Amino acid sequence: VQKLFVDKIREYRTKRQTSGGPVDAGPEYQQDLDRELFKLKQMYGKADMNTFPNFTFEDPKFEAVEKPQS
Template identity: 55%
Template structure:
């Protein structure tokens, strides 16, 4: 009985150690890959993406949009408002459907 209990504890210990080692090796591989120096082109690409992300969060819209872009945008919005009767063009329209009135037919 004691041998059976010992083998059971031994297999549980082995499984726990195995799982812990797999986690540590997996974590070490991720950290090693991050610490490794990137290719200069990859580094430049990632830097530009991070820079654009930062600028887009601070500007709240299109990055580096000059006054000509803003002017064209306002002209297009005013054209659309004239064509479609105004309203908020940045919001999805709400549709209202009425139930049809049906007359009962006598047999």
Template identity: 55%
Template structure:
């Protein structure tokens, strides 16, 4: 009988502790979020980043890019195209190896 009461008491204690922990974890998450929002420098920094991101999306590129920036960008793109053989620099290059089929044929013949 005492053993039965001990098991019953332990299950009640376990459920009370789990409810308390669950409540404290939920409360600490809310407090942490509020504490994070209280830092004015961090909030201002994130607001400016979000504002710049929104303006860049509406502008369709770099926000507040002047003619000097555009000129520098086109010069650098021209240098890269000349250095890497032209073409579209946003696509992965297609590699062509002449005579590769002959080498693969020789390897497969030697394996047989």
């Protein structure tokens, strides 16, 4: 069964030799995972690839009142 085994190892290395990527997928796997990630990134969040976030916040204005005693 080792002679059957190396026959499998041959066909993995011809699958390693790629130049156009998915040969058997075609437009079916290309339209799927592009629409699948964009449906998941819409649930994930709108964040850029290199834009680091920076912002500031405003604290509450500590006001005062009057009370006449003594």
